[PDB]
Amino acid sequence: MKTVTVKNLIIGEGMPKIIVSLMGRDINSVKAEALAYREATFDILEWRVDHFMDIASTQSVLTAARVIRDAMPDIPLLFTFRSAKEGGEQTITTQHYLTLNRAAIDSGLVDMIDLELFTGDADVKATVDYAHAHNVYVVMSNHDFHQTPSAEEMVLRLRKMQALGADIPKIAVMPQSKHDVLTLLTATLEMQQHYADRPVITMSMAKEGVISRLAGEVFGSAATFGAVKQASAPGQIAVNDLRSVLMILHNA
Amino acid sequence: MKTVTVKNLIIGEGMPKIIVSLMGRDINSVKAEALAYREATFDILEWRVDHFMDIASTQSVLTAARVIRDAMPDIPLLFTFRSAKEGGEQTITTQHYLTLNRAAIDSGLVDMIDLELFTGDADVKATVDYAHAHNVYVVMSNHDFHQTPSAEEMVLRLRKMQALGADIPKIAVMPQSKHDVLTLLTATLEMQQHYADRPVITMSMAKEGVISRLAGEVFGSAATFGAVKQASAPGQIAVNDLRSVLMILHNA
Ligand SMILES: *C[C@H]1C[C@@](O)(C(=O)O)C[C@@H](O)[C@@H]1O
Ligand SMILES: *C[C@H]1C[C@@](O)(C(=O)O)C[C@@H](O)[C@@H]1O
Incomplete structure (x- = not known):
């Protein structure tokens, strides 16, 4: 597996890495959240740019x-x-979308960008190449907030992300049943066992899917999202509790 | 679901109940373990009689x-x-085995007995009847320490235990792969959602299976084993850590 090492953090080995999302509506709230987040313990900070209400200005975003x-x-x-x-x-x-991402990439301010798989193949390839030209890693992503695709369809998407040059494929899906949570775990393990050439991140969202956010070390998800104070998606739990569970599973 | 209530503990609702096993060779060792276990927090005490030396004397066992x-x-x-x-x-x-179990039952000393499904039909039926006639619950059980049967075979076993009057069907199986852990979870969920009318206990043993000991509330296992200081089977984790995880999942 080609792991992804960012600022001495090895993604794809050991305990799943903890990601938290920063959501602020304006510059003052982003500053306040960034300061407040310093005392939480996590591995990667995701800035959820779509929660920022001055995305109209590239200057404001940067x-x-x-x-x-x-x-x-x-x-x-x-x-x-x-x-x-x-x-x-x-x-x-x-x-x-592409302009904001390219500006983020070439600014040197960020280590990684999230790029959605279904943005369009030509645009995805161009943006992956641009990221790599500037030493930025790509978390290539896909989300289904309505339902859970078949394990086979989820694996297909993750493999497509690999084919397009993703550093870390990622998929988040919404369970309509507890069975759907097992489907997501099954897809994750299939990637781990058979299509294992780089780290993958997976999650089943919402309350029923919480176990998928805890079991990454076993079935092969390289990272997991927790909440500092507000969740960025249904099913995220308090980040310190997430960390406690990951540590217990790792040391079992 | 019809729950099983013992000494104010409701098995089959809420958070999975924590069982610990007491293992001692003789009276003094059993006393020392019972004393040490006073410092631990758990819901049910299992006496593992097969770890006792003088099992030949019914008097010694009682x-x-x-x-x-x-x-x-x-x-x-x-x-x-x-x-x-x-x-x-x-x-x-x-x-x-029948003598010890009948004596345990009719002595009034125990709330529950474990009865192995594969002991033989006549002995199982007679022992279930005897247990029930004396207000003792039956954990009817099956274990494979070598491998994991198919989900279909496991579900059929659990349903057979229900049909034979088990108060709590129980199966423990050994994974030879991560896939086998998902098979056990699948069987658990199938049984709980489509056939069970009473609590069931399931587990995938060993390190690979530990998630099954943590995820009972989600997939349908009503109890889980932890270790006070020594495990009674591979994969049991420290009882306080088990409790921490169960609480986090319950409140998520
Ligand atoms: C990657 C994506 C994952 C979440 O949707 C989730 O934890 O379910 C949260 C989002 O903030 C992330 O961008
Ligand atoms: C029920 C059975 C379960 C264990 O085998 C286990 O936790 O895997 C432990 C034994 O002590 C129990 O009898």
Whole structure:
């Protein structure tokens, strides 16, 4: 497996890495959240850019990224604009999405970007290449907030992300039953056992899916999301409790 | 679901109940373990009779049961002779197994007994009837310490235990792969959602299976074993850590 090492953190080995999302509506709230987050314990900071209400200005977006970087200079920083199509807070044009991501990449302020698989193949390849040209890793992503696809369809998507050059494929799906949670775990393990060429992140969302956020070490999810004070998706638990469970499982 | 209530403990609702096994060779060792276990927090005490030396004398076995009952008067007490055939510490004749179990039952000293499904149909039925006639619950059990049967075979076993009057069907199986852990979870969920009318206990043993000991509330296992200082089977984790995880999952 080609692991991803960012600021001395090895993604794809050991205990799943803990990601938390920063959500602030404006520059002052982003600053305050970045400061407050320093005392929480986690491995990677995701900035959920689609929660920022001045995405209209590239300057405002980059200044917010810089505020976060300056508060947490040694933390892996992941820039994520979640599109409305895939469960995010606001709709913007594909060109605006690509522009924000390219600006994040070439600014040097972030270590990683989230790129949605179904943005379009040509645009995805171009943006992956641009990320790599500037020493930025790509978490390539897919979300189903309505239901859980078959294990086979989930594996297909993850393999497509690999084929497009993703550093870390990621899929999040919504269970409609406890059975659907097992389907997600099954897909994760299939990736782990058979298509194991780089780290993958998976999760089944919502209350029923919580176990999938805890069991990454066993079935092969390289990272997991917790909540500092507000969750960025259904099913995230308090980050200290997440960490406690991951440690108990790792040492069992 | 019809629950099983013992000494104010409701098995089959809420958080999975914590069972610990007491293992001692003789009266003094059983006393020392019972005393040490006062510092631990758990829901049910299993006496693993097959770890006792003088199992030949019904009197010796009953005197030890009485010592444990009197050491822990308010704790649900489960009498378990695990046969060597099913992963226990020593062999026993079927007739002497019946004698010990009947004596335990009619002594008033125990709340529950473990009865192995594969003991034989006549002996199982007679012992279930005897248990019930004396207000003792039956944990009817099956263990494979080598491998994991198919989910279909496991579900059929659990349903057979229900049909034979088990108060709590129980199966423990050994994974040879991570896939086998998911098979056990699948069987558990199937049984709980489609066939069970009473609590069931399931586990995938060993390190690989530990998630099954943690995820009972989600997939349908009503109880789980932890270790105070020594495990009674591979994969049991420290009882306080078990409790921490169960609480986090329950409140998620
Ligand atoms: C990757 C994606 C995962 C979540 O949807 C989740 O934890 O379910 C949260 C989002 O903030 C992430 O971008
Ligand atoms: C019921 C059975 C379960 C264990 O084998 C286990 O936790 O895997 C432990 C034994 O002591 C129990 O009798």
